[PDB]
Structure 1
């Protein structure tokens, strides 16, 4: 550890060639995404054999005995898999293969072609249905499988196809279809758009086609489904239905996907993945262009996966809310009212979609601003939902196990967005992100703009490069520390890497080396000062030191005890080094501002030292007043935020994020730090807990701890709003302040009074700064 460990590190990723390579990857990714965000190559999604077979059913509008879209028949004939099924070869899902295969078999029979394909397809369906022994063998179900498959299978039965219609599993599916259809408000199908519109081809005996046009999408589709639209067309001859089918054929050529368009969801998924991989800083232009498009279509009623959906989609809406707010767009959590029954109700469609919607709702709820009760309500509901989902058999299907769904849900629930280490979350996501991830709707599908090898290649390389740069900085840090004189204060533990981690895990960009270096120096100094005032120093010694603090005179130190003479000299040097660097970056005088900051901090320590000497227990009000100042976060934060390469802070701009006595970023960070610290420790003078109990002699320790949290929770919401709020403060500065708070909140998370885990701190340093990602 310390000097020896850090100087033993020899990372290859520091060489310029690695960054040059990453820049090639960045250019390649910009070119890849260009059609999606700026061109007309939006909605890149794999073929749906199931839907393609429905489109193939449509007879020629000229009345001749052939398909209107004969290229779809040719596609089907040429794309059977080796086992006789149709679907995506890389991923096997039973329900997907069963549905697509029966769909293709029937249309080939309709047109009296592909006799060999039909024979092989029928064998696949029969063969595989007979392997289903019980419910737990069925695996994950494609959208509305229970509704559609019995219907499609009855079509086959009327043609007397050699399939096992009398299997228990078949009877069970009909039972499930009945239980789904029982909750159906049929009269409302025609009046209120609903998820069932995605699958009209499965409920043909129920739908009055003469009334169904009222809920058609503006593009002519029925909830973006080619199959459902093809069905309505064949029953109605509706011109707009045909226009939709034509538009999809024009786009894809000789097949159709199971959803179209997916313009909103795809854009959001692209952004979400780029952000989670930690590579977002390379794609500011593309992220803005993507989210600007989503925002244009953002409305009070929510959004669907495609901009023309006549009903909103919780998955896409919750994802949109979070990403838009995170990128400083003005959105309101009142959009979630669109998904309440009159509270929430999502849990009706297919399982992966429902789980995804709730994961997204859970994540969105954590970005709550003050007074947003609906998001507190959303958090509760989603948490309960996800905990229940963990106990469901569907969660442990072969398909879900292969994708580690249970693990993903568990990780989400144990993870607080506020109490996260940003660099570590990106590192962890690089280990979970799948270039070949397969999604489920009417069929299994992929979105190559979202899931691809280039994203991951860049994610791993970029992480390693940044880390190697930090490793060189840590050599500088430990080298400085060794020669600084600070190690002479043997009453204080040496922790330079812990303090470097506090800033570097959130403010990681290469250009902010000076910020990280100066922040670390000040944090090292402060830990000595803290131990001196609250432990080592006598009140009479501290009175002397505090007088020297007022004087700003090196010559005055002749009065101090030897250890204080040295301490004062180091303190004086660090303060003025930071100030010179700040003045250089900011182009204005800042020595006076820094000096006032330091004296307020240390005068705060001295007040505390007087209390200790007198065994005085403050009121909670006086404790918090003192604590916001004496905790030292304000002056530490200032020692980094004013020296960020290229980030100009006028006095006016600075006062927006730093202003003692006001609820701005540095003040809220100070309050959060003080109180989070207390909740985590305090059990291991007097803390906020103990002060509250003096104020309330009859209250229990339990009530006391609850009270401290009642102060913390609102503070965290304010911190979030202050961070994300639109203003003219350089965003890099606000992010630096916010990210230091997030890393602090990690150190103090799950406050039970027990104390901070030293082994976990070391583990965070190992993961973040020491161990690279394997390439």
Structure 2
């Protein structure tokens, strides 16, 4: 499919006038909200609720500290309140004990079925059940419990609750994309809340709409940068998904301070997409081998062994990193670009092996499979690329990333296992007997069902691992853990109808793209 979008995102003339109007009133709403947080005699359930709402609306990135000091204090000092308190502290790194859920369970470890009539309690427990780590076996039955009752109780709930419950049973807050969920909360829920806080709603719509202007600009910038390359008329075999790449970079981070980073990350994602397309639906055994080698060396002098068409990809790639080296200059962080590069070569290496395995009809043992198939997700790559733009990222931080941290390793597994479950049958048809599930089935001598079932558990384990990763002390500043977390969210979001949303956007991403980069939240 050619691009659903077309030249539509190419032009964007911001109404500075409008943007200024929005900015000014927002600053005034910022302070009003700030003072809401600083209120002295508030109850626990009112404070936890306040913070929950500000976060969901997507304006919590303004009061990053105010909210931290409040949770810290709440950490150093009913089901609904408990689970919420749990989730919020945990998402922030505070390792609060699960024995809070003790007083809600029987002597036999399970939850009292007498709670089945507490919807708000069941709901917040459901959301909290997704941020559990391996040491939280107390919450082993939290999800199936709250789910079954939520489903049963939802059809007769008043709105918007009913709509909030039905949506959560399809997508939990923790594992969803921030912008996407915020767009859902503001318009479909909080705006329709009878007790909604007018100041916070107003604040929430302006802000979301204002940052949408910036994203619209960014995407424009990237849409012109993508036409001046003409891989649309030059390299027809490749996928034109620059908008979808932007959604991915927007999923990694949306704050305005990451404007430089996002644009950097979009160019990479788009770029590497081409290379997979080359190795997959185009280049030949020899051509690919010549391409992988070319990449590994890295010096334009080689654009020669490469066929004419691979010459274009290769040059574009090298110039992109030269641009990167150039953008950074001002700060003096050009010496970190290499980090992204060594990862890219790693992706290219495996891409090659992947093909080699396809020609020989090799069906590796799962062990050997992942050792190679993990990087081909490009997740170490994007993770490493996401830092480039972050003005705070140091060498000592990339060094952390280069050792393949457990949080990153788990983010990558989630992207691998889910992708292999969602694209088994298709990839198979094409003769690729090297696909996850296959190696799994033959390796463990199990059915397709059992193989997928075992891959799911890998993902669950992975999540439990990512949740631990967020706990303090954090190996690096939380600021650099979130990009990894979000990447995993993006996987969970893109393959929900259990299907490639980036290779088949229409049913999954299109909507998000429309609600995030097209339609503004009507005030």
| In 2, Cα distance between equivalents of 1:741 and 1:752 | 16
2:59 corresponds in structure 1 to 279
Secondary structure of the corresponding residue to residue 292 of structure 1: helix
Matches within 5 A, 1:670-685: 670-684=412-426, 685=432
Matches within 5 A, 1:13-52: 15-34=19-38, 36=39, 39=40, 42-43=41-42
Deviation at 1:292, TM superposition (A): 3.2
Secondary structure of the corresponding residue to residue 683 of structure 1: helix
| In 2, Cα distance between equivalents of 1:472 and 1:347 | 52
Secondary structure of the corresponding residue to residue 758 of structure 1: coil
Secondary structure of the corresponding residue to residue 482 of structure 1: coil
As a proportion of its length, which structure holds more helix?
2
- 1:768 corresponds to 2:516: yes
| In 1, Cα distance between equivalents of 2:336 and 2:506 | 36
How has the CA–CA distance of structure 1 residues 404 and 551 changed in structure 2, closer, same or farther, with 3 Å as cutoff? closer
| In 1, Cα distance between equivalents of 2:500 and 2:444 | 19
2:100 corresponds in structure 1 to 335
Q: 1:657, 1:664 within 8 Å by CA — same for their partners in 2?
A: no
Q: 1:642, 1:649 within 8 Å by CA — same for their partners in 2?
A: no
1:7 corresponds in structure 2 to 10
| In 2, Cα distance between equivalents of 1:673 and 1:409 | 27
2:487 corresponds in structure 1 to 740
Residue 406 of structure 2, aligned match among 660, 663, 674: 663
- 1:364 corresponds to 2:128: yes
| In 1, Cα distance between equivalents of 2:214 and 2:338 | 34
1:149 corresponds in structure 2 to none
How has the CA–CA distance of structure 1 residues 703 and 753 changed in structure 2, closer, same or farther, with 3 Å as cutoff? farther
Q: 2:37, 2:67 within 8 Å by CA — same for their partners in 1?
A: no
| In 2, Cα distance between equivalents of 1:758 and 1:270 | 36
- 1:749 corresponds to 2:496: yes
| In 1, Cα distance between equivalents of 2:376 and 2:14 | 39
| In 2, Cα distance between equivalents of 1:517 and 1:592 | 18
Q: 1:641, 1:737 within 8 Å by CA — same for their partners in 2?
A: no
Deviation at 1:455, TM superposition (A): 0.5
Root mean square deviation of aligned Cα: 2.5
- 1:452 corresponds to 2:217: no
Residue 207 of structure 2, aligned match among 456, 462, 470: 462
| In 1, Cα distance between equivalents of 2:175 and 2:151 | 20
Deviation at 1:616, TM superposition (A): 1.6
Question: For 1:468-491, what per-residue CA distance to the aligned partner results, in whole angstroms no more than 9, with x for missing partners?
Answer: 110011110100000024332110
1:378 corresponds in structure 2 to 142
1:207 corresponds in structure 2 to none
Matches within 5 A, 1:581-730: 581=327, 587=333, 589-645=335-391, 647-651=392-396, 653-660=397-404, 662-665=405-408, 667-684=409-426, 685=432, 686-697=434-445, 699-727=446-474, 729-730=476-477
Please say which of residues 752-761 and 541-550 is displaced more in the overlay. Answer: 752-761
Deviation at 1:533, TM superposition (A): 1.3
- 1:544 corresponds to 2:308: no
- 1:484 corresponds to 2:229: yes
Q: 2:116, 2:122 within 8 Å by CA — same for their partners in 1?
A: no
Q: 1:676, 1:749 within 8 Å by CA — same for their partners in 2?
A: no
Question: For 1:426-473, what per-residue CA distance to the aligned partner results, in whole angstroms no more than 9, with x for missing partners?
Answer: 1111121159745xxxxxxxxxxxx42100000000000011110011
Secondary structure of the corresponding residue to residue 425 of structure 2: coil
Deviation at 1:385, TM superposition (A): 2.2
How has the CA–CA distance of structure 1 residues 535 and 542 changed in structure 2, closer, same or farther, with 3 Å as cutoff? same
Question: For 1:216-275, what per-residue CA distance to the aligned partner results, in whole angstroms no more than 9, with x for missing partners?
Answer: xxxxxxxxxxxxxxxxxxxxxxxxxxxxxxxxxxxxxxxxxxxxxxx1111101101101
How has the CA–CA distance of structure 1 residues 436 and 600 changed in structure 2, closer, same or farther, with 3 Å as cutoff? closer
Deviation at 1:753, TM superposition (A): 9.2
Secondary structure of the corresponding residue to residue 281 of structure 1: helix
Deviation at 1:592, TM superposition (A): 4.2
| In 2, Cα distance between equivalents of 1:418 and 1:680 | 21
Residue 268 of structure 1, aligned match among 48, 53, 70: 48
How has the CA–CA distance of structure 1 residues 290 and 437 changed in structure 2, closer, same or farther, with 3 Å as cutoff? farther
Q: 2:56, 2:181 within 8 Å by CA — same for their partners in 1?
A: yes
- 1:499 corresponds to 2:263: no
Secondary structure of the corresponding residue to residue 414 of structure 1: coil
Q: 1:583, 1:590 within 8 Å by CA — same for their partners in 2?
A: no
Deviation at 1:728, TM superposition (A): 5.3
How has the CA–CA distance of structure 1 residues 583 and 637 changed in structure 2, closer, same or farther, with 3 Å as cutoff? farther
| In 2, Cα distance between equivalents of 1:556 and 1:711 | 41
Residue 758 of structure 1, aligned match among 506, 511, 517: 506
How has the CA–CA distance of structure 1 residues 31 and 563 changed in structure 2, closer, same or farther, with 3 Å as cutoff? same
1:416 corresponds in structure 2 to 172
| In 2, Cα distance between equivalents of 1:266 and 1:360 | 14
Deviation at 1:583, TM superposition (A): 6.6
Deviation at 1:411, TM superposition (A): 1.7
Q: 1:585, 1:643 within 8 Å by CA — same for their partners in 2?
A: no
How has the CA–CA distance of structure 1 residues 753 and 762 changed in structure 2, closer, same or farther, with 3 Å as cutoff? closer
2:73 corresponds in structure 1 to 293
Q: 1:467, 1:768 within 8 Å by CA — same for their partners in 2?
A: yes
Q: 2:130, 2:175 within 8 Å by CA — same for their partners in 1?
A: no
Residue 388 of structure 1, aligned match among 127, 133, 152: 152
| In 1, Cα distance between equivalents of 2:222 and 2:239 | 16
Q: Larger Cα Rg: Structure 1 or Structure 2? A: 1
| In 2, Cα distance between equivalents of 1:614 and 1:464 | 52
| In 2, Cα distance between equivalents of 1:602 and 1:739 | 24
| In 2, Cα distance between equivalents of 1:700 and 1:637 | 33
Q: With CA pairs under 8 Å and 6+ residues apart, which has the higher RCO, 1 or 2? A: 2
1:61 corresponds in structure 2 to none
Deviation at 1:738, TM superposition (A): 1.3
